Amino acid sequence: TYPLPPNLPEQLPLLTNCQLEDEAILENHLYQQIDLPNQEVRNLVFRDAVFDHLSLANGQFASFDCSNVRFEACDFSNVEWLSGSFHRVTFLRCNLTGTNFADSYLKDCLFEDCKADYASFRFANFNLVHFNQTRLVESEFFEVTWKKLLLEACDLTESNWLNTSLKGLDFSQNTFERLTFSPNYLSGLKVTPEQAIYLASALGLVIT
Amino acid sequence: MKITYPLPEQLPLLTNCQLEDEAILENHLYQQIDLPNQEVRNLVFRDAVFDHLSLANGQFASFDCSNVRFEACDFSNVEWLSGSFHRVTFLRCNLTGTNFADSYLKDCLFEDCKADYASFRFANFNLVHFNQTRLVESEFFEVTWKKLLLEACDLTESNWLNTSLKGLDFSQNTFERLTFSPNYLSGLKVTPEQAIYLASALGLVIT
Ligand SMILES: [Cl-]
Ligand SMILES: [Cl-]
Ligand SMILES: [Cl-]
Ligand SMILES: [Cl-]
């Protein structure tokens, strides 16, 4: 089962500028080429919309609510989305470098061809979340609660999976040269022989 | 090379003998003696060599063995439960099903022995070396050990539950599979092929 895509019509009216205010709702448009760096805005609602080349770089968005939205080629580098809510959201070709989603709720979300090195999902709750062709080097998947999590064609090198169940995940279609994990949460992970050898070494086997 | 002193017409020969409770066999070369199906308590073998002794199917309560060479002896299906072994070498012995459960083995060597089904369950090892010894379906569970070495042994289907594998080297041995405790695995040295087995036994689903 794949995440549901955002519920969008074929045609949405185009806007090339927007303003952010606390409790503001941005909805029902295609928002294109907007550069709003270093903002701090509470209780934002983005819904039923597409954002194309939006930058919120170094933004801080408390109690963020996002539903039925596709973000395309957006810059969210270092953004704080602590305890955010994301439902039927796609991040496509987005810069998520250092983006902080700690404590967020993600349901029916897709990350496709994103740069997400150092991104944090610490304590996140996932339900139908798919990472596809997304770079996740030194990312944080610490104590994540999840159902129907899929990762394919992702670079997971040095990602942190401590306190997160790996039972029923398939890392065989991803790459990692290093991985941090909890030994008691390892059983049931699907891997290649090369990955198995790495994991066995990480568990303390001395392999010739 | 050993870190302890080696074992020494050097000894007078005996080619027959009888066993009785509390018997002490010492200071002889005992050779070609067939004594199967014995049940003898507090037997002592010491300062002696036994060449082609059979004790097949023997039952020995509180066996005590010290400074002894066993060469080409048959101990198949012997029970030496809670035995005491100090400075003992087993060379080309048949140890099929031999039961050492709960024994103490200090400075012992098993060289080129056939030891299918042999049990060391609950044993305590203190300087014990297995070399070129077949240990298929053997028991090594709940074993406490210091200076245990195994080399060129077949460990297929041996059982190591609740025995620490930290500091052991199985890479110089072979096994198709074996049973172990996950929490006792760290620090074992293995080949990649062995590691793949162990990884799958830990529940990794390997493509
Ligand atoms: Cl989409
Ligand atoms: Cl890999
Ligand atoms: Cl060893
Ligand atoms: Cl265990």
Coordinates of C-alpha atoms and ligand atoms in Angstrom, one line a residue:
Chain A
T1 CA 0.0 0.0 0.0
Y2 CA 1.4 3.4 -1.1
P3 CA 0.7 6.7 0.6
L4 CA -2.3 8.5 -0.9
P5 CA -1.1 11.4 -3.0
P6 CA -2.5 14.9 -2.1
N7 CA -6.1 15.2 -3.2
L8 CA -5.7 17.8 -5.9
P9 CA -7.6 19.0 -9.0
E10 CA -5.8 19.1 -12.4
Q11 CA -6.0 22.9 -12.5
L12 CA -5.2 25.3 -9.6
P13 CA -5.1 29.1 -9.9
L14 CA -1.5 30.5 -10.0
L15 CA -0.1 32.9 -7.4
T16 CA 3.5 34.2 -7.5
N17 CA 3.7 35.8 -4.1
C18 CA 2.3 35.1 -0.6
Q19 CA 2.4 36.3 2.9
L20 CA 2.7 34.3 6.1
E21 CA 0.9 35.3 9.3
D22 CA 0.1 33.4 12.4
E23 CA -3.0 31.2 11.9
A24 CA -2.9 32.1 8.2
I25 CA -4.3 29.5 5.8
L26 CA -2.7 29.0 2.3
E27 CA -5.1 26.9 0.2
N28 CA -6.5 26.2 -3.2
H29 CA -3.7 27.6 -5.3
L30 CA -0.5 26.9 -7.1
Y31 CA 2.1 29.0 -5.3
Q32 CA 5.2 29.6 -7.4
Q33 CA 8.7 31.1 -7.0
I34 CA 8.3 32.6 -3.5
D35 CA 11.3 33.2 -1.3
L36 CA 10.4 33.7 2.4
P37 CA 13.6 32.9 4.4
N38 CA 14.0 33.1 8.2
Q39 CA 10.4 33.4 9.2
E40 CA 8.8 32.5 12.5
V41 CA 5.1 31.9 12.2
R42 CA 2.7 29.9 14.5
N43 CA -0.4 27.8 13.6
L44 CA 0.1 27.9 9.8
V45 CA -2.3 25.8 7.7
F46 CA -1.1 24.8 4.2
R47 CA -3.8 22.7 2.4
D48 CA -5.2 21.6 -0.9
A49 CA -2.4 23.4 -2.7
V50 CA 0.9 23.0 -4.7
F51 CA 4.1 25.0 -3.8
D52 CA 6.7 25.1 -6.5
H53 CA 10.1 26.7 -5.7
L54 CA 8.9 28.0 -2.3
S55 CA 11.8 28.7 0.1
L56 CA 11.2 28.7 3.8
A57 CA 14.9 28.2 4.6
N58 CA 15.7 28.6 8.3
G59 CA 12.1 29.0 9.1
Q60 CA 10.4 28.1 12.5
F61 CA 6.8 26.9 12.2
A62 CA 5.1 25.9 15.5
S63 CA 1.9 23.8 15.4
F64 CA 2.2 23.5 11.6
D65 CA -0.7 21.8 9.8
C66 CA -0.3 20.5 6.3
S67 CA -2.8 18.4 4.3
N68 CA -3.3 17.5 0.7
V69 CA -0.3 19.5 -0.5
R70 CA 2.6 18.8 -2.9
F71 CA 5.8 20.6 -2.4
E72 CA 7.9 20.7 -5.6
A73 CA 11.5 21.9 -5.6
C74 CA 11.1 23.7 -2.3
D75 CA 13.8 24.8 0.1
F76 CA 13.1 23.7 3.7
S77 CA 16.8 23.6 4.7
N78 CA 17.1 23.8 8.5
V79 CA 13.3 24.4 8.9
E80 CA 11.7 23.6 12.4
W81 CA 8.4 21.7 12.1
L82 CA 8.3 20.4 15.7
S83 CA 5.1 18.5 16.4
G84 CA 3.8 19.2 12.9
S85 CA 0.9 17.4 11.3
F86 CA 1.3 16.2 7.7
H87 CA -1.5 14.3 5.9
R88 CA -1.5 13.4 2.2
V89 CA 1.7 15.4 1.5
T90 CA 4.3 14.9 -1.1
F91 CA 7.8 16.4 -0.9
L92 CA 9.2 16.2 -4.4
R93 CA 12.8 17.2 -5.2
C94 CA 12.9 19.3 -2.0
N95 CA 15.9 20.4 0.0
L96 CA 15.2 19.0 3.5
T97 CA 18.8 19.3 4.6
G98 CA 18.7 19.6 8.5
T99 CA 14.9 19.8 8.5
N100 CA 13.6 19.1 12.0
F101 CA 10.3 17.1 12.1
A102 CA 10.8 15.9 15.7
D103 CA 7.5 14.8 17.4
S104 CA 5.5 15.2 14.1
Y105 CA 2.6 13.1 12.8
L106 CA 2.9 12.0 9.2
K107 CA 0.1 10.1 7.5
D108 CA 0.2 9.2 3.8
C109 CA 3.4 11.1 3.1
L110 CA 5.9 10.7 0.3
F111 CA 9.5 12.0 0.1
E112 CA 10.6 11.6 -3.5
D113 CA 14.1 12.5 -4.8
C114 CA 14.7 14.8 -1.8
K115 CA 18.0 15.9 -0.3
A116 CA 17.5 15.1 3.4
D117 CA 20.9 14.8 5.0
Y118 CA 20.7 15.5 8.7
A119 CA 16.9 15.6 8.7
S120 CA 15.3 14.7 12.0
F121 CA 12.2 12.5 12.6
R122 CA 13.1 11.9 16.2
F123 CA 10.0 10.7 18.1
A124 CA 7.9 11.1 14.9
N125 CA 4.8 9.0 14.4
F126 CA 4.5 7.5 10.8
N127 CA 1.5 5.9 9.2
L128 CA 2.0 5.1 5.5
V129 CA 5.2 7.1 4.8
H130 CA 7.4 6.4 1.8
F131 CA 10.9 7.6 1.2
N132 CA 11.9 7.1 -2.4
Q133 CA 15.4 8.1 -3.9
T134 CA 16.0 10.3 -0.9
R135 CA 19.4 11.1 0.6
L136 CA 19.2 10.5 4.4
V137 CA 22.9 10.6 5.5
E138 CA 23.2 11.2 9.2
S139 CA 19.4 11.6 9.5
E140 CA 17.6 10.8 12.7
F141 CA 15.0 8.1 13.0
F142 CA 15.3 7.8 16.8
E143 CA 12.4 6.2 18.6
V144 CA 10.0 6.5 15.7
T145 CA 6.6 4.8 16.0
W146 CA 5.6 3.6 12.5
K147 CA 3.1 1.5 10.4
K148 CA 3.6 1.0 6.7
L149 CA 7.0 2.7 6.4
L150 CA 8.9 2.1 3.1
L151 CA 12.3 3.3 2.0
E152 CA 13.7 2.5 -1.4
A153 CA 16.8 3.8 -3.2
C154 CA 17.8 5.9 -0.2
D155 CA 21.2 6.6 1.2
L156 CA 20.9 5.7 4.9
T157 CA 24.6 6.0 5.8
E158 CA 25.1 7.0 9.4
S159 CA 21.4 7.3 10.0
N160 CA 20.3 6.8 13.6
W161 CA 17.6 4.1 14.2
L162 CA 18.1 3.6 17.9
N163 CA 14.8 2.7 19.7
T164 CA 13.0 2.1 16.5
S165 CA 11.6 -1.2 15.3
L166 CA 13.3 -2.5 12.1
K167 CA 11.0 -5.7 12.0
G168 CA 9.4 -5.8 8.6
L169 CA 11.5 -3.0 7.0
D170 CA 13.3 -3.7 3.8
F171 CA 16.8 -2.0 3.7
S172 CA 18.0 -4.3 0.8
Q173 CA 16.9 -1.8 -1.8
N174 CA 18.8 1.0 0.0
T175 CA 22.4 1.7 0.8
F176 CA 24.2 2.3 4.0
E177 CA 27.9 2.1 4.8
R178 CA 27.2 2.6 8.5
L179 CA 24.0 2.4 10.6
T180 CA 23.2 3.1 14.3
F181 CA 20.5 0.7 15.6
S182 CA 19.1 -1.1 18.7
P183 CA 20.1 -4.9 18.7
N184 CA 16.7 -5.8 20.3
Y185 CA 14.9 -4.1 17.4
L186 CA 16.9 -5.7 14.5
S187 CA 15.1 -9.1 14.0
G188 CA 12.9 -9.1 10.9
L189 CA 14.8 -6.5 8.9
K190 CA 15.4 -7.5 5.2
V191 CA 18.9 -6.9 3.9
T192 CA 21.5 -7.9 1.4
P193 CA 24.4 -10.3 2.4
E194 CA 26.7 -7.3 2.4
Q195 CA 24.5 -5.4 4.7
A196 CA 24.0 -8.5 6.9
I197 CA 27.8 -8.7 7.2
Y198 CA 28.0 -5.1 8.3
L199 CA 25.2 -5.5 10.8
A200 CA 26.8 -8.7 12.2
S201 CA 30.1 -6.8 12.7
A202 CA 28.2 -4.0 14.4
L203 CA 26.8 -6.5 16.8
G204 CA 30.3 -7.4 17.8
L205 CA 31.2 -10.4 15.5
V206 CA 34.8 -10.3 14.4
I207 CA 34.6 -11.3 10.8
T208 CA 37.6 -12.4 8.8
Chain B
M1 CA 53.4 -23.9 22.8
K2 CA 52.0 -24.7 26.2
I3 CA 52.1 -22.3 29.2
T4 CA 52.1 -25.2 31.7
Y5 CA 54.7 -28.0 32.1
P6 CA 54.4 -30.9 29.6
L7 CA 53.4 -34.4 30.6
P8 CA 56.5 -36.5 31.2
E9 CA 60.1 -48.6 29.2
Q10 CA 59.6 -45.2 31.0
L11 CA 56.7 -46.8 32.8
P12 CA 56.0 -50.5 33.8
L13 CA 53.5 -52.1 31.5
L14 CA 50.2 -53.8 32.3
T15 CA 48.0 -55.4 29.7
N16 CA 45.2 -56.5 31.9
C17 CA 43.5 -55.1 35.0
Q18 CA 40.2 -55.0 36.9
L19 CA 38.3 -52.0 38.2
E20 CA 36.7 -51.8 41.6
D21 CA 35.2 -49.0 43.7
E22 CA 38.1 -46.7 44.9
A23 CA 40.6 -48.3 42.6
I24 CA 43.7 -46.2 41.8
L25 CA 45.4 -46.9 38.5
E26 CA 48.8 -45.1 38.5
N27 CA 52.4 -45.2 37.4
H28 CA 51.9 -47.7 34.6
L29 CA 51.4 -47.9 30.9
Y30 CA 48.1 -49.7 30.6
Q31 CA 47.7 -51.2 27.1
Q32 CA 45.1 -53.2 25.2
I33 CA 42.6 -53.5 28.1
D34 CA 39.0 -54.0 27.2
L35 CA 36.7 -53.1 30.1
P36 CA 33.3 -52.1 28.8
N37 CA 30.1 -51.8 30.8
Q38 CA 31.7 -51.1 34.1
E39 CA 30.1 -49.2 37.0
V40 CA 32.8 -48.0 39.4
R41 CA 32.8 -45.2 42.0
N42 CA 35.6 -42.9 43.0
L43 CA 38.0 -44.3 40.4
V44 CA 41.3 -42.5 40.2
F45 CA 43.6 -42.6 37.1
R46 CA 46.9 -40.6 37.7
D47 CA 50.4 -40.3 36.5
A48 CA 49.9 -42.9 33.8
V49 CA 49.3 -43.6 30.1
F50 CA 46.4 -45.7 28.7
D51 CA 46.8 -47.0 25.2
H52 CA 43.9 -48.9 23.6
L53 CA 41.9 -48.9 26.8
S54 CA 38.1 -49.4 26.3
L55 CA 35.7 -48.2 28.9
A56 CA 32.8 -48.2 26.4
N57 CA 29.4 -47.7 28.1
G58 CA 31.1 -47.2 31.5
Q59 CA 29.4 -45.3 34.4
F60 CA 31.9 -43.6 36.7
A61 CA 30.8 -41.6 39.8
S62 CA 33.2 -38.8 40.8
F63 CA 36.0 -39.9 38.4
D64 CA 39.3 -38.3 39.1
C65 CA 42.0 -38.2 36.4
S66 CA 45.3 -36.3 36.6
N67 CA 48.5 -36.2 34.7
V68 CA 47.3 -38.9 32.2
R69 CA 47.7 -39.5 28.4
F70 CA 44.8 -41.4 26.8
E71 CA 45.9 -42.7 23.4
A72 CA 43.5 -44.6 21.0
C73 CA 41.0 -45.3 23.9
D74 CA 37.3 -46.0 23.5
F75 CA 35.2 -43.9 25.8
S76 CA 32.0 -44.2 23.6
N77 CA 28.9 -43.6 25.7
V78 CA 30.9 -43.2 28.9
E79 CA 29.4 -41.2 31.8
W80 CA 31.9 -39.1 33.7
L81 CA 29.4 -36.7 35.2
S82 CA 31.0 -34.3 37.6
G83 CA 34.4 -35.7 36.8
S84 CA 37.7 -34.0 37.6
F85 CA 40.4 -33.8 34.9
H86 CA 43.7 -32.0 35.5
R87 CA 46.5 -32.2 32.9
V88 CA 44.9 -34.9 30.7
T89 CA 45.5 -35.5 27.0
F90 CA 43.0 -37.4 24.8
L91 CA 44.7 -38.4 21.5
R92 CA 42.8 -40.3 18.8
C93 CA 40.1 -41.3 21.3
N94 CA 36.6 -42.4 20.5
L95 CA 34.5 -39.9 22.5
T96 CA 31.2 -40.6 20.7
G97 CA 28.4 -39.7 23.2
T98 CA 30.9 -39.4 26.1
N99 CA 29.1 -37.4 28.8
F100 CA 31.3 -34.9 30.8
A101 CA 28.3 -33.0 32.1
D102 CA 29.2 -30.8 35.2
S103 CA 32.9 -31.8 35.0
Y104 CA 35.9 -29.6 35.7
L105 CA 38.7 -29.8 33.1
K106 CA 41.9 -28.0 34.0
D107 CA 44.8 -28.1 31.4
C108 CA 43.3 -30.7 29.0
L109 CA 43.9 -31.4 25.3
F110 CA 41.6 -33.2 22.9
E111 CA 43.7 -34.1 19.8
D112 CA 42.3 -35.8 16.7
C113 CA 39.3 -37.3 18.6
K114 CA 36.0 -38.5 17.3
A115 CA 33.5 -36.8 19.6
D116 CA 30.1 -36.7 17.9
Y117 CA 27.3 -36.2 20.5
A118 CA 29.9 -35.6 23.3
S119 CA 28.5 -33.5 26.1
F120 CA 30.2 -30.8 28.1
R121 CA 26.9 -29.3 29.3
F122 CA 27.5 -27.3 32.6
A123 CA 31.2 -28.0 32.5
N124 CA 33.9 -25.7 33.7
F125 CA 37.0 -25.3 31.5
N126 CA 40.3 -23.9 32.6
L127 CA 42.8 -24.1 29.8
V128 CA 41.2 -26.6 27.4
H129 CA 42.2 -27.1 23.8
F130 CA 40.3 -29.0 21.1
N131 CA 42.2 -29.7 17.9
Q132 CA 41.1 -31.6 14.8
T133 CA 38.2 -33.1 16.9
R134 CA 34.8 -33.9 15.4
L135 CA 32.2 -32.3 17.6
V136 CA 29.0 -32.8 15.5
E137 CA 25.8 -32.5 17.6
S138 CA 28.0 -31.9 20.7
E139 CA 26.8 -30.0 23.8
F140 CA 28.6 -27.0 25.1
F141 CA 25.6 -25.3 26.7
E142 CA 25.9 -23.5 30.1
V143 CA 29.8 -23.9 30.0
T144 CA 32.0 -21.6 32.0
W145 CA 35.5 -21.3 30.6
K146 CA 38.9 -19.7 30.6
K147 CA 41.5 -20.3 27.9
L148 CA 39.3 -22.4 25.7
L149 CA 40.6 -23.0 22.2
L150 CA 39.1 -24.9 19.3
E151 CA 40.8 -25.4 16.0
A152 CA 40.0 -27.5 12.9
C153 CA 36.9 -29.0 14.6
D154 CA 33.6 -29.7 13.0
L155 CA 31.0 -27.9 15.2
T156 CA 28.0 -28.6 13.0
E157 CA 24.8 -28.7 15.1
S158 CA 26.7 -28.2 18.4
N159 CA 24.8 -26.4 21.1
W160 CA 26.3 -23.3 22.8
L161 CA 23.2 -21.9 24.6
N162 CA 24.1 -19.7 27.6
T163 CA 27.8 -20.0 26.9
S164 CA 29.9 -16.9 26.2
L165 CA 31.4 -16.8 22.8
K166 CA 33.4 -13.6 23.4
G167 CA 37.1 -14.4 22.7
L168 CA 36.5 -17.7 20.9
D169 CA 37.6 -18.2 17.3
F170 CA 35.3 -20.3 15.2
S171 CA 36.8 -19.0 11.9
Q172 CA 39.4 -21.8 12.2
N173 CA 36.6 -24.4 12.6
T174 CA 33.6 -25.4 10.5
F175 CA 29.8 -25.6 11.0
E176 CA 26.8 -25.8 8.7
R177 CA 24.8 -24.4 11.6
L178 CA 24.9 -24.3 15.4
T179 CA 22.7 -23.1 18.3
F180 CA 23.7 -20.1 20.4
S181 CA 22.4 -17.4 22.6
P182 CA 22.1 -13.9 21.0
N183 CA 23.2 -12.1 24.1
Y184 CA 26.4 -14.2 24.3
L185 CA 27.5 -13.7 20.7
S186 CA 29.5 -10.5 20.7
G187 CA 33.3 -11.0 20.4
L188 CA 33.2 -14.3 18.6
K189 CA 35.6 -14.5 15.6
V190 CA 34.0 -16.1 12.4
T191 CA 34.3 -16.3 8.6
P192 CA 31.9 -14.3 6.4
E193 CA 30.0 -17.5 5.6
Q194 CA 29.6 -18.3 9.3
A195 CA 28.5 -14.7 9.9
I196 CA 25.7 -15.0 7.3
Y197 CA 24.4 -18.1 9.2
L198 CA 24.6 -16.3 12.5
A199 CA 22.9 -13.2 11.0
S200 CA 20.0 -15.3 9.7
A201 CA 19.7 -17.0 13.1
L202 CA 19.4 -13.5 14.7
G203 CA 16.4 -13.0 12.4
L204 CA 17.8 -10.9 9.5
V205 CA 16.0 -11.7 6.3
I206 CA 18.9 -12.0 3.8
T207 CA 18.3 -11.7 0.1
Ligands
CL1 CL 2.4 13.6 -5.8
CL2 CL 24.5 -1.1 1.4
CL3 CL 39.1 -20.8 19.5
CL4 CL 20.3 -14.6 24.9

